[PDB]
Structures are given as C-alpha cells and as structure tokens.
C-alpha cells in the first residue's frame, strides 16, 4: 500500500510535470522583450500616518480607496482616513497579538486575527456610535495569518494549522474547510470574481481553491522557501507569490506553471508583502531590507525602490482605483506612496 | 477645513490622546516569552503567578510572560511577533538525556533565528533534583549519549555552592557548558544567554528572571548612549 501508493504519486507527478513541460512553448521574457519598458517609477511619501505604538502587521484599503485599516501589536486596529490622515476609529483588540486585518467590501465591517486563533468581526457602523465586536469565529487550531471577506457575511481565513476555512458570520460555523497544505498558510488572495482563492503556505507551494466546490483545483511549486505573502493578477487568470528565498514568482491559472522570477543578487532578504498595480504592469513588493522594491511584472526589471521606511515593510496595498500605495512597517509608520509626474 | 472636518480633526486628536495614554500605561510592563519542551515543566518556573499569559510582579516591576501553547510543533513564523520581548525564558529538562540533544537543537534554532538576533535568552536547567538523583544512582551514564563527557573534566575554579559530590557538579556544569557553547558560537555579543538551575520547587525563579532583566535592560541602555 504505501509503496504502490507513493509509486502512483510518483507517476502522477511525472504526468503533471511533463504535461507542464509540453505547455512551455515559450517564456514571458521571449514574448515581452519587444515591448517598451516602464522606465523609472519614482514614488514620494505623499502622506505619513502615525499613531501606532508598535510594529504594524497588516493593512487593507477600503473599497472607496480612502479608508484603510491597520493592525499592530499595540493592541489597536485603527481605521485611517488616508486623504486627511484622520483616525476615524480606534478599536481596542481583545488580544494584542494581531497578525492580519481586513476591510469588508461593504465598509460596514472589519476583521482581525492573530495568535488567539480567533477571527473577530467588528461592526463599524452601529447605532450606539461605538464599534463593537459582532462575531468571534473560533474553530482554528493555529494562529491566523490572513482573512478576507467574500461579500458581507462569508470570510475566508487561513490559519497556521495548514488549513483554510470559509466562515459564516451569522452562524459562526465553518461552512467549508480546505485541506492539503503540509505547512503553515501565511497568506491568501481572493480572486476579483470572489469564486476562487489562492493560499501561500510554508511548504514552498501555493494552492488554488474553489469556495463553492470546497476542494483545491491546482497546486504550484517552484519556491525554495516559505511563501510569506501572495497576491492576485487583476485579470484573475494569474497570481504572484512572495517567498523568503528573496525571489518573487508569477504563476498562471491556465498554463499551470511559473512565468517569470523576479530576482536580484543585491537583495537577499525575503519578500514580506506582494501587491499588484491596477493595470498589472507594476508588481509592488515589500522586503525585509526596509525597502519596497517595485518590480516590472512583464520585464523583471526594478523600475523603482520606495525607500522610505526604517524597519521591515510588513504590509502592502494598492487602492481600488490604483491611485496610491500604502506600505506599513514595524516602525509603526504607515506611509501612502503616490506617483507624481 | 470645513466645520465637519474641524470636528473630525478634534475626534482624531482625542483618539491620539487615548492611544498615547494607553501606550504610556502599557509601557510600564516588561514582556517575556516562555519556550520549552513538553517534559520541560515550563509552567512551574515562576511558580506563584491560545497564549497563556502569566503576570507576576517583583520589586514593583510588572512582568508579562506569554506561554504560546498549542499552535503547532514548529516555533517559527509566529516568533516574529515576539521580536520586542525583553528576554526569552527557555526551559529545558536536564534530567532526561534522551531528549537533551533535541533540546540542544531547539536552543540552536532559537539562538540563530534572524528575528531573535537581538533578544537575549534566560535559560533554565529544570529538574535539578532528578538530575542529581539520576547521576547518584549511576544506572544511566551521560557518556552513553554524549561521548565527549568522558574526556571532559570539571571546570577549574568553578562555583559549586551547594554541598554535593563532584559527580553532580560535573554533570551540571557539563550541561551548562553544552548550552553555553551554542550560546556563544554566534550573536557577536548583540545578545547573551544566562544559564541557571531550577529544582522545580524553588520560589526564587522570579528573582533570577528580574536580576537578569536588569542586565538586559542595562545593556540596552548602554547601547542607546553609544557607550557600547
């Protein structure tokens, strides 16, 4: 049984690998080298948001591209007004070890999660005028690393117990649980259609899941270390991964293989956050070197370095209209970066 | 600014004031992380007390200790959060030599962690009485698992304050030096490991954790004034 089974696995993997080789008929490089390069993307610190007293661990732009929510080990979950650097809300978290935060598409709710293995949903728009926790989603046997609302009542959370789960806020029970990862899941990225969602795990692999089907569809390998952050191409047919091996990788949902590796000998630290631009031509990517290096998605050429921060760029994010980039770091400063002509 | 943006700015100022007050209130406590094996008896260290937070006060200084139970077997990818802790209280069972090598491996992994390159470690050798009884009986030999013990002799000019036979002192200092070798093989002086000995019944563990956070904080103060 174990012999024949591993044998089956081996020959199946052989098929997958060889099938992938077949597809490879060219490279993104040999198909993109004839296009004009982006040039040099220079970004200034257009706004600095301060008030946190500890390392910022996550951020998430609202759907209006104006409000963002930042979570830090201070124990607070602030709702910034990025246009005027005003703190709309300051939610005191039950546990001061938050590792992720999320803003619902509706703008009505926010979520936080950390080492308490509980996702707390806060009702920002309440009649009493105070943001109070509306539901605590317990049932995870590991630290929470990422959470994303589906529309307003389903939230997909990835924990350190090698499982990702789809929740029902009204009932508080896991509608569907996703298994298959052999290591801690560090990030997830919902597709624009909110029908598929990927997850980057510490097993140096990424899996494409289906929220309705409840099981994985594709798996992707090629990273030499843990995947700290993952994103999604705006078209929904590709995604990018940020690993600890200092190389970003762009995968595809159809060719089922990596496309281009964003590497440089100057940088040896791992990528902490990966965020795509509105058009998908620019690949923002934070690094542990305190610098967010902007990568050309179709060229793997460093267009620019957002060099402002003083400790690891911990979270990233691009507005829904693509008008700004917000990078949060362990120095408690959240800086909004915008490009000027 | 309009009349509704001036009031919004006033609300933001009040939020800032509350945040600063909360930060000032929370800055008076020292944060610690307790790490160790299942048989290490980690919980029993400070005695009279997903994260089992333990708060004890000594010399009018409030200590916060975060025992991260459950989670998964690995201690990585969650230890990034504990980058600002003053010290790490590593507890290891020194009486079970079968799992002693894996304890050395765990300590090596903790010491060489990239995010703990500046966080000191307060190491506790738990189960002193069991170790003494085991080496007194002689049924289990330390040299059986560690061949270098037989050639190793007692450290010259040591400090064996309690009145035990040379075998107990030799074994205790052998384990202590085994941990210290990994402690000093790296860190380049940015952080140091303080080894102690715990009998699983002593109530002075809090004092040792304090007297040692006064040399972790003193070293940090020396580094701010560039006097080190």
């Amino acid at each position: 049984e174990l012999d024949q089974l591993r044998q089956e696995a081996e020959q199946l993997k052989n098929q997958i690998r060889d099938a992938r080789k077949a597809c490879a008929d060219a490279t993104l490089s040999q198909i993109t080298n004839n296009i004009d390069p982006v040039g040099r993307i220079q970004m200034r610190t257009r706004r600095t948001l301060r008030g946190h007293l500890a390392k910022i661990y996550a951020m998430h732009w609202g759907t209006d591209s104006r409000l963002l929510v930042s979570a830090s080990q201070d124990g607070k979950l602030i709702i910034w007004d990025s246009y005027t650097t005003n703190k709309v809300h300051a939610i005191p978290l039950r546990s001061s070890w938050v590792m992720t935060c999320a803003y619902a598409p509706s703008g009505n709710y926010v979520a936080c999660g950390g080492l308490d293995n509980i996702c707390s949903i806060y009702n920002l728009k309440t009649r009493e005028g105070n943001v109070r926790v509306s539901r605590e989603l317990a049932g995870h046997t590991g630290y929470l690393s990422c959470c994303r609302f589906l529309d307003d009542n389903q939230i997909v959370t990835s924990s350190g117990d090698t499982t990702c789960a789809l929740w029902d806020i009204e009932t508080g029970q896991q509608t569907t649980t996703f298994t298959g990862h052999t290591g801690d899941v560090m990030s997830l990225s919902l597709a624009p259609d909110t029908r598929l969602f990927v997850s980057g795990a510490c097993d140096a692999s990424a899996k494409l899941w289906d929220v309705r089907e409840g099981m994985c569809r594709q798996t992707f390998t090629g990273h030499e270390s843990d995947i700290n952050a993952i994103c999604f191409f705006p078209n929904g047919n590709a995604f990018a991964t940020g690993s600890d091996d200092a190389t970003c990788r762009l995968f595809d949902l159809r060719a089922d293989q990596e496309l281009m590796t964003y590497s440089h000998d100057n940088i040896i630290c791992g990528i902490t956050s990966v965020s795509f631009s509105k058009s998908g031509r620019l690949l923002l990517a934070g690094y542990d070197d305190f610098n967010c290096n902007v990568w050309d998605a179709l060229k793997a050429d460093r267009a620019g370095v957002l060099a402002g921060h003083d400790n690891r760029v911990s979270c990233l994010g691009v507005t829904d209209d693509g008008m700004a980039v917000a990078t949060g770091s362990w120095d408690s400063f959240l800086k909004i970066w915008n490009g000027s002509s | 600014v309009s009349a509704e943006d001036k009031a919004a700015a006033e609300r933001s100022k009040m939020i800032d004031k509350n945040l600063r007050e909360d930060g000032e209130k929370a800055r008076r406590t020292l944060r610690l992380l307790l790490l160790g094996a299942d048989n290490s008896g980690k919980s029993t260290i400070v005695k009279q007390m997903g994260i089992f937070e333990t708060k004890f006060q000594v010399d009018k200084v409030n200590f916060h200790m975060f025992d991260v139970g459950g989670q998964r077997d690995e201690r990585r990818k969650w230890i990034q959060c504990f980058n600002d802790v003053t010290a790490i209280i590593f507890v290891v069972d020194s009486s079970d030599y079968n799992r002693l090598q894996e304890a050395l491996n765990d300590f090596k992994s903790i010491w060489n962690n990239r995010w703990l390159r500046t966080i000191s470690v307060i190491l506790f050798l738990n189960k002193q009485d069991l170790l003494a009884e085991k080496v007194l009986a002689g049924k289990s030999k330390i040299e059986d698992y560690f061949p270098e013990f037989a050639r190793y002799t007692t450290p010259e000019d040591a400090t064996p304050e309690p009145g035990e036979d040379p075998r107990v002192t030799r074994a205790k200092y052998f384990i202590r030096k085994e941990f210290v070798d990994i402690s000093t093989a790296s860190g380049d002086g940015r952080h140091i490991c303080y080894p102690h000995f715990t009998c699983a019944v002593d109530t002075e563990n809090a004092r040792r954790i304090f007297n040692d956070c006064k040399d972790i904080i003193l070293q940090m103060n020396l580094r701010e004034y560039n006097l080190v």
Partner: single-chain antibody
Framework: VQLVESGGGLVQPGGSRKLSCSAS????????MHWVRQAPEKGLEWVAY????????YYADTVKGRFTISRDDPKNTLFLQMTSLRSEDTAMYYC??????????????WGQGTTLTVSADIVMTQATSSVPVTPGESVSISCRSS???????????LYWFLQRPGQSPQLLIY???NLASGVPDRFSGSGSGTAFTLTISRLEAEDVGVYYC?????????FGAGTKLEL
C-alpha cells in the same frame, strides 16, 4: 438611543433656567451635542453646540453670553444654563446628537423636547411653505443658500429634516446625497452647490409634516423656513 429633556416650565423675564438633557443608549462621550429651539408657530433655529470632550463651544450670535452650555460625561447629561431670559426666548428646546468622522451622520437623533414659556449668516430660503399634495404622486421640496455650500473637499454640507405633527424632527438626508439610516429609499436628494432640491418618489400617509433645510459649511448653523406638506 433615547434623549429625554426635562426642566422647562414658566420663567419670569430676566430670570434663570437650567435645562437638562438625559442621554441613555449610546456612547455619550463620543457624540457632539447641539441645542435647537423652536418658537411656537414658527421655525427652528440653532442655539448652542459643545463638541466631544468639551473642546470647542459655539453659540449663536443672539444667545451668546446669556446662554452657557455644559456637558457631563460621567452620567451622560447635557446642560443648558439660561441667564437673563427674554420674551422671545419661549421655545421648545431640542437635544440633538451629532458624531463627526468621515462618513458619519450628524444630527441623526433628536430629543423629545421641553416647552419653555416666558411671561454674515447663510440664510436658507424656502419660498414655498405649504404644498397640498395627495399620496401616490411625487412632491419636490426646494432649497437655496446665499453662499455655495459646496466645499473644496467635495462635500456639499446640506441636511434635511422631517417634523411630523406633534413630534420631533427626524433626519432624512445628510450631505445632500446620503440617505439616513432607517429612512425609506423613497426619499432622494440632489442639486448643486447653491440650488438644492428634495424629491420623494411615492408618498404615503406618514410623509405629512414640515421639511426644514440645513447648512453646515460654517459655525452659525441656519435652518430653513420650512415647507409644510398638507394631506
């Protein structure tokens, strides 16, 4: 969410009266509170306002000095000390809460009100005061301001209120575009920086009342003359 105001009887001219507004059901300390009067058989006008934390206090030019405001956070009570009352001061004083952040709904809840009987401002004009209309059709309520309420931030600060007969004013639309919570989708608002209109698609029996305009670009807050909707 409930505001009860007590302490209004009859006061001789030139006397002193203390008003109390009891708050219970929401975070009182986080809400800025206003005092709004309403003379009998007349419109309503702003009187005083104290921000959250008692930071900034603004009084209308006709009540400055004579009236002093004071809130009490520990037991959620709003006070309005009255000195040297005049014969024109007899009005029903309303207790209104207002929270100010990005996307909030100021002047959302109004108190029951207490009756008192004494023995450079943007004037909002509502030329039409009585529109006899039947349920089922659509009625448009117009407003106009001397100063363009449109601000550089992109928000036109004009609010609307509904005063049912023998009731308290209820917020319908804030910032001229956003519908208040609980208001039916039948109400709609539009206009420009100077011209403002209020439109109702389908009108039911509960829409009978007086509609008042509102301005929030500048501290002196001014209401409209009102537009009664007779059945």
């Amino acid at each position: 969410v409930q505001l009860v105001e007590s302490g209004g009887g009859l006061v001789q001219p030139g006397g002193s009266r203390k008003l109390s507004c009891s708050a219970s059901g929401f975070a009182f300390s986080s809400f800025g509170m206003h005092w709004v009067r309403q003379a009998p058989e007349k419109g309503l006008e702003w009187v005083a306002y104290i921000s959250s934390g008692s930071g900034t206090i603004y009084y209308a030019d006709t009540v400055k000095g004579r009236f002093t405001i004071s809130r009490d956070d520990p037991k959620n009570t709003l006070f309005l000390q009255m000195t040297s009352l005049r014969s024109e001061d007899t009005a029903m004083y309303y207790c209104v809460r207002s929270i100010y952040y990005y996307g909030s709904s100021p002047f959302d809840f109004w108190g029951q009100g207490t009756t008192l009987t004494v023995s450079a401002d943007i004037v909002m004009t509502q030329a039409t005061s009585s529109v006899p209309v039947t349920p089922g059709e659509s009625v448009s309520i117009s407003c106009r301001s001397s100063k363009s309420l449109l601000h550089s931030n992109g928000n036109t600060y004009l609010y609307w209120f509904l005063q049912r007969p023998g009731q308290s004013p209820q917020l319908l639309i804030y910032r001229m575009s956003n519908l208040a919570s609980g208001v039916p989708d039948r109400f709609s608002g539009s206009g420009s920086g100077t011209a403002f209109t209020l439109t109702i698609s389908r009108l039911e029996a509960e829409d009978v009342g007086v509609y008042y305009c509102m301005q929030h670009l500048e501290y002196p807050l001014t209401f409209g003359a009102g537009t009664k909707l007779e059945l």
